[PDB]
Amino acid sequence: MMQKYIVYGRRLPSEKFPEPEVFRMTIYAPNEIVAKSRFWYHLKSLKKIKRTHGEILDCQHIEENGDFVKNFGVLLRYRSRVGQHNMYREVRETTSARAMDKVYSEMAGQCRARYHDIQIINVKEVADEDVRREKVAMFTQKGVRFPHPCPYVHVKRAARTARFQDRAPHVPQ
């Protein structure tokens, strides 16, 4: 559901400063209306330009090619009930937006932090040798094999319409 957007903005031009500077950002958001709001949240803190005093020049939407599985490293900050913290996370996904979906669900589940509690500092691709987290690194290898981690899930699902049967089914492994 996440999407990559590039936003340009600038302070409204005046007599003291004709041709103000242009600032660009990369944003991940579910749509164009949330993305432009998040651009004004940062430009107000980092550059002290409220939304009343500036204008947005573009909301570029960028669609990425998948088809191969890469590593990503996300540097972010979030807020808990006792303060603010920094954190680095690693994930394997096919596009950057999909890697941000995975991050937001792990923050929501293990830290209970929602979307507006989180500021993304950095998102970059990480080559296989340079990985630093054990979970990701296991799969950055040649020849990884494991048996199915939950084959019971197949059997139960079929038993939701086939409510009564004549023998208890097996779980092939």
Partner RNA sequence: GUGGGCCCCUCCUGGUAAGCAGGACGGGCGAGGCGGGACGAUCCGGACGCCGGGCCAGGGUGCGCCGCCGGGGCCGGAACGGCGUCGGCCG
Three-state DSSP at 35 gives helix
User: Could you give the CA distance from residue 113 to residue 109 in angstroms, rounded to a whole number?
Assistant: 8
Outline where 91-173 has alpha helix (H): 96-110, 134-139, 152-158
* Binding test (CB under 7 A) with RNA, winner from 6, 34, 56, 87: 87
- 157 is in the binding site of which of RNA, other proteins, none (Cβ under 5 to 8 A by kind)? RNA
Q: Among 24, 50, 53, 85, which residue sits at the site for RNA (rule: CB under 7 A)?
A: 85
Residues 6+ apart with CB under 8 A from 75: 86, 87, 88, 120, 121, 122, 123
**Helix H or strand E segment including 106:** helix 96-110
Residues from 24 through 63 that contact other proteins (CB under 8 A): 24-25, 31-34, 37, 42-43, 46-47, 55, 57-58
Amino acid (1-letter code) at residue 171:
V
Stretch of residues binding RNA (CB under 7 A), selected from 18-26, 45-53, 65-73, 86-94 = 86-94
Interface contacts to other proteins, rule CB under 8 A: 8, 10, 19, 21-25, 31-34, 37, 42-43, 46-47, 55, 57-58, 75, 77, 83-86, 116, 119-122
